[PDB]
Amino acid sequence: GKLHLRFAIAPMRPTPSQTIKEFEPIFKYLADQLGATYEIVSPESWAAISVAMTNGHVDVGWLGPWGYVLSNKKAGTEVLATVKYRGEPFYKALIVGRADLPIKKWPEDAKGLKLSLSDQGNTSGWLIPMAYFKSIGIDPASYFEYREGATFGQNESQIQHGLIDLGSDMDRGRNGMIEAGQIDPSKSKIVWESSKLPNDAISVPKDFDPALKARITEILTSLSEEKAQSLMGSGYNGFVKAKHSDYKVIEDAGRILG
């Protein structure tokens, strides 16, 4: 009897291969603490990891907030901990624009511009920006030359190459792209930034072994910032214990949008 764990991680970096290269060590560390073998995947979209957890393909998943909320609703998926970025279990959604885009009367001067949002499982990339536009009576699909389903990597690349005017991103991902030399920040600017959102949910299925649940939570939340950072992409530096009600702001946004 060798314990085996199926892991999955959301799109922290622009490609699955970059995500796995940078973030696999925390998963290896976790498995080693348990004496477990493991396997790992990083689906291209935020919805896809939510679906994978819901459909019973994942033992421990690092899901985006809305991905977790959706999976908890559909399948009773449980959040054990929230990831820390720069020491905090929060982040912000962004709408990024071309550097030369006129935005003094944003978004009332933006009708007909090319806007790219992410997949419908993406908290900062889809849910939160849709909630913003709906709060001010804008229907993005009719208001903009609108595209849905892009990755954050695609949005930032398209903005920098002048192929779209506006695209969603998350602050932690944009920071990492700048730091990796993947974005030239002089070619784009932040047009809108959300209020704080709870960070990603380390999640397990409803019927996950209680003893393992407890052990996993303790292993991740006891990590020092230095050790956590040594195992993950730049900026990601630990985990805090979490429960469902920590995701209330996201659940509320999803309700408002139907």
Side-chain angles (χ1 to χ4, degrees), residues 122-179:
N122 190 339
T123 317
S124 57
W126 187 83
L127 182 77
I128 295 303
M130 283 293 297
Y132 169 74
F133 286 120
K134 173 151 170 159
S135 79
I136 62 175
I138 291 176
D139 176 53
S142 61
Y143 192 81
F144 299 106
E145 179 164 6
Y146 180 72
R147 308 182 197 179
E148 201 172 87
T151 72
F152 287 154
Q154 291 170 329
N155 280 349
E156 291 280 7
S157 179
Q158 290 168 25
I159 287 159
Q160 176 166 327
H161 291 294
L163 298 177
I164 61 179
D165 300 302
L166 297 152
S168 54
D169 203 350
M170 65 186 181
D171 59 0
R172 58 194 166 100
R174 181 178 170 82
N175 289 344
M177 292 183 285
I178 294 167
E179 289 160 351

Side-chain angles (χ1 to χ4, degrees), residues 13-102:
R13 296 287 287 128
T15 66
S17 59
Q18 291 167 44
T19 299
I20 291 172
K21 180 202 80 232
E22 292 182 42
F23 292 84
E24 188 174 351
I26 188 60
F27 287 102
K28 179 172 197 310
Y29 175 84
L30 179 56
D32 286 347
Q33 296 310 290
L34 300 167
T37 54
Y38 70 95
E39 57 188 286
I40 187 167
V41 291
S42 187
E44 293 181 28
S45 80
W46 296 82
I49 193 165
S50 181
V51 167
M53 178 52 80
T54 294
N55 288 349
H57 301 303
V58 187
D59 298 308
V60 184
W62 176 322
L63 280 46
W66 179 227
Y68 154 71
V69 167
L70 285 167
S71 194
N72 170 261
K73 175 103 159 185
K74 296 167 185 279
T77 299
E78 180 177 356
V79 59
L80 305 178
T82 300
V83 77
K84 295 158 87 193
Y85 180 83
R86 294 179 172 176
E88 302 291 352
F90 304 98
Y91 76 113
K92 295 179 179 184
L94 308 172
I95 291 169
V96 178
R98 299 185 293 102
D100 55 350
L101 185 76

